[model samples]
Every structure is written in structure tokens, then in C-alpha cells.
Target: MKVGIVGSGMVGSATAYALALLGVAREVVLVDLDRKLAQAHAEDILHATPFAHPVWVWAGSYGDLEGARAVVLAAGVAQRPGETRLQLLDRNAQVFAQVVPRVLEAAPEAVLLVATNPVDVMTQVAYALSGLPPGRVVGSGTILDTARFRALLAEYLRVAPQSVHAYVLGEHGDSEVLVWSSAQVGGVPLLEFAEARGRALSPEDRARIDEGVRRAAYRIIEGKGATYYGIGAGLARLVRAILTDEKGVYTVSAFTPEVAGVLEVSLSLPRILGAGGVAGTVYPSLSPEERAALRRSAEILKEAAFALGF
Candidate 1:
């Protein structure tokens, strides 16, 4: 399968590299307004692929996206100092308006994966602009945040991160909901597992971990100016799920009728991803408090959408 990535910036280039390294797609194409930059990144990956996976990598235009099974929309401005992801909505929406339609025209059958910031809102914008079926449009939402959550949990438990099953739902930003009620370690509730291990994950400990997961991006951005690796891997995983029809469960942003009484907004939830993009969503059982928090998160996204004149 082939995947087209729009944008050759940090996240976009990293995604191309990951996709090539992991053999997630048979061909990877990089597109950017800066054609030379895109070509340079694509050539760099092409040279490295010989030592990793034998994948065809190149830089190309929107027309090159044709016949691709999926296209990741990573084209957007970087978040500035002290600027929240939500604050990036308007400018990125303008970028999407110019790019998404051209992408659809080029690769109408391709699953559109939005990786731009304020991804939930951008995903909504992509869907509205592309007019694609809901299932075929997805956002690289809280998947990265959920990975951070699981990694932190695994560190605390001294277990492999894969053994920890948890999800960060709702918006991928400050309003994200970390579903601790459903978090498990080796099929046991995290709290129970901690007790069995003679470790106490007190309320304060849980709060600290939650805060860490939420603030992880800020800390990374503070040090490096941008985050790419985790998100790049996340995007590759999404591509693999789509191409292989794995039906993998991921917290991707998509349009939903309602989630915790919240409606008409694209936000993160447990979604079954396959060839059709977001094939379905699994609504986990949430405590009333968790459900209410999810509703509030939905409201926060809705407010951002309203501000963008959606």
C-alpha cells in the first residue's frame, strides 16, 4: 500500500521515516509547499531505507497522491511559544481549506488522516471540506497521549508498556480524558495490580501521573521546539492498521453522533481502525464522573470550533 504525507516539516518527515523503517507501506510519498525540502527529506529516507526496509520513497505533488490507499494531512504551522493547540485552530483550518480539497481530488478513495494541531477540530474541518464519508476521515488524536499514559504506567509498575491497557480520550490537548477507571495491568485493574505488587498508587500518585501524561508534550516541546517521534510512530501505526485491515483499536479522532452526551464534534475515542479508516467506535464503560468530564471536554472542543466560525 502507498501513503501520501502532506507537509515535510518535523512531524511529516519523521512520519515518512518511520513508515519506511517499519515497512508500513510499500511506497511513501512526501509533499510540501517547499518542494526542495520535501525532496531532501524523501531522498534522505530513500537512502536510509536500504539498511532498513526496501520501500519506495519520494517527494511529489498532490497529483502523485493518486492511487494511494491513505494520505496523512500534516501540513500546518507549528505551535508557537505559550500558544495552545486550540489557539492554532484558525490558521491551520485555513491551511486545511487549501490542501484537503486538492488531496481529495487527487486521491478520492484514500483515507484522510489529519495530523495537524488541534487535531480534533482539524479533523472536523477536513471532513467538512473533503466531504468524505465519516469512516474514511480520521485524526491522529490522543493516540500519542495514550501511549505516554501507558508508558508512565508501565514505568511505575516496572512492566512492559504493552501489558498496560489504557486510553486518553476526548481532545488530544489539555481537555483530554485519561480513562483510569478502565486502565488495566495484565487484565487486572491498575489499582488492584499495584496492591498485589505491594505498591500504593495513591490518589496523589495517580494525579501526578495524569499531570505528567497531559504535560508531556509541553516538556518535550520546551526542550526540542517540536515533538515528532512518538507522533510519527503513531501515524505509521495508523497507516499499517488501514493497509493491513488490522481493525486495531486506537484512540483516533472522528465524527460521532454522541459521546457522553456530547455531539457533532470530532474527538478522541476508542476506534476500530481498518481499511475503511475508523470502522467503528467502542464506548467503554465510564464512571459518571468520567462521563461528565468527557462531556466537558467535548464542550471545550465545540467552543473552539465555534470560535473558528464552524
Candidate 2:
């Protein structure tokens, strides 16, 4: 499958490189408004060709998206110091207005995976502009949040992240919600697993973990300029799912109108992401608290969408 990436910044370039290295797509097009930056990233990735998955990688223009199966939009301003993800919504939404329509014009059939900050908001803008099926537009949503949850679980259990099965629901930003009731480790419930090991995590421990996960982006942005690796990998995997028809059930920001109000609401639920884009979503069995949290997150996005003139 062909993949097109818009933007040659760290996250976008890193994802392009990762997709090439993993052979996730047969043709990878790295697009940046700055031709030189895109060329540099493409050349850097090409230099690593002998090391991993063999694929065709090149720097190209948005017009190169003609046959691409998936388009990942990562071009936008980075989050400023001390800014919450929502704070970037307006600015990034403007970027989406400029870039998304061109991408849709170039690759109308491609799945549009949004990675701009306030990703869900950007996804809404893309959805409205592209006029693709409801399933074709998605956001990187809570993928990073889920990864953070697994990382924390690994740290607490002293096991590999793969052994943890957990997910963060709702917004991918500060208001994002973590669903603790459904977290499990190796088929064992998180709490029970902790108890079985004679090392129960206290309520305080859980709260702290949640807080850490929520503030991770801010903390990282404070230390460095921005976060790249984890999010790059996340976006790459999301693109891979669409390119390869993986049908992966990852929590991406998807448009759920029936259970949740339409008008471009983005929330975390088990979504079937495949070659045709987001095929469908399976609303997880949520506890009352989880349900409330999701509603709140959706409300936030809904308001943001309206603020964007939804």
C-alpha cells in the first residue's frame, strides 16, 4: 500500500522513517511545505535502507498522494510550553483547513489519519472537509495514552508492556480519562493481579499513575521541546492498520454519532481500523464512571467543534 505523510517535522519524519523501516507500506511519500526539509528526512531514511524492511521511500509533493492508501496529516504548530492539547486546537484547526482539503483532493480514497495537536478537532475538520465516509477520518486519539498506561503497568508489575492489556478512554488531552475498571494484566484484572502478587497498588498509587499519564505530554514538552518517539510509533501503527487491513481494535478518536452526539465528537472506544479506514467501533462495556468520563470528554470535543463553527 502507498502511504503519504504531510509534514517533515520530527513526528511526521519519524513516522515516515518507521513505516519505511517496518515495510508497513510499499511506497512512502514524505511531504513538507519546505522541500529541503522533506528531502533531508527522505535522504536520512534512505541511508538506513540496508538495515531493515525494504521499501520505496521518497520526498514528494501532496500531488504524489494519488494512489496512496493512507494519508497521515502531521503538519501543524507544535504545542507551546505549558500549553494543554486543547489550547492548540484553534491554530492546528487552521492548518488542517489549509492542508486537509488539498490532501483529499489528491487522494480522495485514502484513509485520513490526523496527528495534529487537538487531533480529534483536526479529525473533525478533515471529516467535514473531505466528505469521506464516517469511517475514513480518525485521530491518533488515546493511542499514546494507552501506551502510557501499559508503560506504567510494566513499571509496577516488573513485566513487559505486552503483558498488560489496558486502555485510556476519552480525550487524548488533559481532560483525557483513564478507565481503571477494565485494566487487566495477562488476563488477570489489574487489582486482582496486584493482590495475587501480594503487592496491591493503593488507591493513591492508581491516582498518581493516572495523573502522571495525563500530564505526560506537558512534562515531556517542558523537558524537551516536544514529544516524538512514542507518538511517531503510534501514528505509524495506525497507518499500518489502514494500509494492511489489520482490523486492529485500537482506541482512536472516531466519530460516534449514535451512542454519542454527532457534530464531530471524538472519543476512545474499541474501533475496527483496517484498509478501508475505521470500519466500525465496539463500545466497550464501561462502568458508570467510565461512561460519565467518556460523555464529559465527548462534550468537550463537541464544544470545541462548535467553537470551530461545527
Candidate 3:
């Protein structure tokens, strides 16, 4: 499989490395405004491939994306100091305005996976500009947040994270929802399983986990500069699912005619994805409270996008 990554900065470069290391793509191309940066990351990954995967990774322009099976939109300005992801919209939106068309025109059949922050909204911008179907263009929505949620639940339940099945839906950022009503571990309800293991979850304990999942990016940014590993690996996983035609279900953002009371909004939902991109949506059964929260979150994105005339 051939994969193309735009914006060869922290997020884009890391995704290339992750994809190459996973051996998910036979070829990987890096495209960016910074030609040298893209080339540097490509060469670095190419050098490391011998120990990882024999993937042919290289720096290429949009023209090189001819046969890309998946093209990731990671082009955008880095979130500023103390800036919220939503605050990145104006700058990132402009970046995607030009970037999305180039990618789609280059690889019209490719599944577009978006990794830019404020991804839910950015994905919408890309969707509007690219004549592609909603399924073919998606945002890396709550996938990482959902992973963080499961990890926290697993740790609290004293079990391996993979055995814990939970979902974080809605927006990718602070408004993402932890679907506790449907969480399970090995077919056992989360709360029941926790109590059975003598580790019942309390509201306070749940709140702590919530904060852990929600505040993870901020804390990581505070400690270092940017957060990428989790999202990089997450992007690789998404590509694998698409390239292999796995028909996997992931919480990815795609344009929808309606979400809660909002119309024509793009936000995270449990979507079935495959080689053809998003196949369908498997809406999670949310509690009344969770549903309400999701509505508010959708409104935030809708307001921000509409405010910008998107």
C-alpha cells in the first residue's frame, strides 16, 4: 500500500515513522511546505526501515501521491502556547483549504485521514473542499481519547487495556464523551467487573480517570512540546484498518447531516471503516446525560465552523 503524509512537522513526520515501522504501507511519501524537513524525515525513516519494515519511504511532492491508498492531512500550524485546539481553526483552516484539494486531486481514491488538531472541524473543511464522499474524508476524532479512556479503565480495573471495550465519542478535544453506559471488559459490564474484582469505580475515581484522559495532551505538552506518539500510532492503526480492508469500527469524525439537534456537523462517531473508507456508523447507545453532553459539544464545533463561514 502507498501512504502519503502532508505537513512533515512533528505530527506528520511521526506518522510516517509509525507507518513505516508497522510495515503497513509498501511506500510512504512525505509532502510539506518545508521540502527539506519532509526530505529529512523521509530519509531518516528510510534509514531506520532496515531494522523495522522494508518500506520505501521518501520525500515527495503532491504529484508523487499518485497511487496513495491513504493520504493523511496533517498540515496546520502548531497549537500556540495555552491555545485551545479550536483556536487553531483560522490558521489551520487556511492550510487545509489548499492542502486538501491537492491531496484529493493527486489521489482521488485514497481514504483521507485527518490528524490536524481541532480535527473534527478541520475534517469538515476538508470535506467541503474535496468533492469526495463523507466516508472517504475523516478526522482522527476521539480515537486517541478513546484509547486513553480504555487505558485508564484497564489500569483502574487491573486488567489489560485491550480487554476493556469502551468508547469516547463527540469532539476530539475536551468535549469528547466517555460512554460509560456501554463500557465492558471481557463481556462484563465495567462497573460490575470492577466490583467483582473488589475495585468498584466510584464517581470520584471515574472523575479522576476522565481528567486523566482529557488532560493528557496538555500535560504532555507542558512536559515536552508536542504530543505525537499516541496519535502517530493511532494514525498507523487507522491506515492498517483501511489498507487491510479490516472493516474495523473506530470513533472517527466524518460529516453527518445531523448530530443531536445540530444539522450538517462533523464530529466523532463510531464508524465502520475499510478499504473504501467509512462504511457506516454504529451509533453508540448513550445515556440521556451523555447524549445531552454530546449535543453541546457538537454545537461548539458547529458554532465555530459557522462563525468562520465554513
Candidate 4:
């Protein structure tokens, strides 16, 4: 399978490396407005191929995307020190306008996975611009958020992250909500898991973990210019699931039309992604407070969509 990556910035480059290491595709194409930057990233990956996956990797334009099975749209501006993802929408919308059409023209069948900032809003813009069905377009949504939840549980239980099953739902930005009520550790409720471990979390402890997960991106971005590791890993995992027909259930941003009168809103929830892109979706039960949080997140995305004139 061919995999194309647009934009060779920090996140894009890191994602390319991760995909290459996993050998998820037979061919990898790196595209960037700055040809030199793309070539540099391609070279770095090529040099490590002998120690990793054996795949054909190079730098090219949208023209090279002709037969790619999956294309990761990681092209866009990064959030500045105090900028929220929503604030980058207009700028990234312009980026999407320039790139999405070329991609569609070159590879209309390719499943599009977006990792651009203001992801939920940009995802709606891409859906409108590409004119693809909702199933074929998705954002790297709260996959990273869910990963953070599992990681924290692993630390708290002194177990592996993969053994902890938890998720953070709703918007992928500031309004994103964590579904603590449904979190499981080792197939048991988190609270149960803690009890079995002879430990119990106080309200303050739960608050601390939630704060850490929510502020994770901000803290990383403040230390560095941007946070790429978690999100890049998230993009790679989503791409692999779609291309390989894994049909994995994870929290990802998808286009949801009017549901009980909620219109033009995009949010992250448990979604099955496989060969045909988003195969199915499941909404887990939420507490009264969690339900209120989701409603607020949907409203936030709806407002952002309107601001974009969608």
C-alpha cells in the first residue's frame, strides 16, 4: 500500500518516521511546499530503513499521491504559546483549501486522515472541500487523549498502558471531556482496580490526574515549540487500522449530522476504523455531568463551524 504525508514539519516528519518504522505501507511519499525539507525528512528515514521496515520512501508532490491507500493531512500552522487550536482555524482553513483539492484530484479513493490544528473544525472544512463521505474523512481526534488516560492508569496501578482500557471523549481541544465513569483497568472499573491494588483515589487525586491529562499538550508545547510524539503515534495507529482493516474501536473525530437537533458538529467518540475508513461508531454511556460536558463540547464545535462560514 502507498501512504502519503503532506507537510514535513515536526509532527509530519515524526509521523512519517513512525509509519516507516512500523512498515505500514509498501511505499511512503513525503510532500511539502519546501522540497528541501521533504527531501531531508525522506533521507533521514531512508538512512534508518536497514534497521527498521523495508519500504520504498521518497519525497514528492501531490502528483505522487495518485495510488496511495491512505493520506495523512498533517499540513498546517502549529499553535503558538498561548493560542488555542480554535484560534488557528482560519489560517489552517487556507492551508486545507490549497492542499485538499490537489489530493482529491490525485487520489480520490485515498482515505484522508487529518492531524491539522483546530482538528475538529478543520475536519469539517476538509469534509466540505473534498466532498468525501463522512466515512472517508477523520481527524486524529482524541486518540491521544485516550492514550493519556491509559498511561495515567498504568502509572497509578504500576501496570502496562496496554492493559488499561480508558478513553477521553468529546471535543479534541479545551472543551474535550474525560469519561472517568467508564474507565476500566484490566477489564475492571478503575475504581475497582484501585481497590484491588489496595489503593483508593480521593477527589483531589482524581482532579490531579484529570488536570494532568487535560493540560498535557499545553505543558509540552510550553516546554518545546510543539508536542508531536503522542499525536504522531495516534495518527500512525489510526492509519494502520484503516489500511489493514483492523476495525479497531477508538475515540476519533468524525462528522456527525443532526442528532437530537445537534447540527454540523464534529466530536470524538468510540469509532470503528477499518478498510473503508470509519466503519462504525459507538457512544458509551455517560454520567449526568459527562453528558452535560459533551453537550458543551458539541456547542463549541458548532460555534467554530459557524465562525468558519460553514
Best by lDDT: 1
Predicted candidate 4, C-alpha RMSD: 2.2
Separately for all candidates shown, the number of backbone clashes (residues 3 or more apart, or on different chains) is 0, 0, 0, 0
Every model's TM-score: 0.95, 0.91, 0.96, 0.94
Error of 4 at 56 (Å): 1.1
- Give a tens-digit lDDT track for model 4, residues 193-269: 89889878788878888887898899988999788877877788888998899988989888887532478677788
What TM-score would candidate 4 get against the native?
Answer: 0.94
Residue 122, candidate 2: Cα error in Å is 0.8
TM-score attained by model 2: 0.91
Ranking by lDDT: 1, 3, 4, 2
lDDT per residue (tens digit) for residues 1-310 in model 3: 7999998988998899999988999999999988899999999999999998799999988999998999998898766898865567777888888898888888989989999877888888988888888888988999988989999999888899999999998888888888999889999988789989998788899899999989989999999988898899999999999999999889999998888888998999989999988999887888999999999999998987798777
Q: All candidates' lDDT scores?
A: 0.90, 0.83, 0.89, 0.85
The clash tally of candidate 2 reads 0
The digit string of per-residue lDDT tens for model 2 on 1-310 reads 7899998899898898888887788788899889999999988998787798777888998899898888989898767998866667767777778888888788888888888767777777888877778788888989988889889978888878999888887778877778778888999988898888877888888898888789989898999988988888889999988877898789898777744443447666668899888888887667887778777788888888888775
Candidate 1 residue-wise lDDT at 84: 69
Off by over 4 Å in 1: 78-88
Looking at model 4, report the run of 10 residues with the lowest lDDT sum.
257-266
TM-score leaderboard ranking: 3, 1, 4, 2
lDDT of 3 at 36: 90
Candidate 3, lDDT over the whole model: 0.89
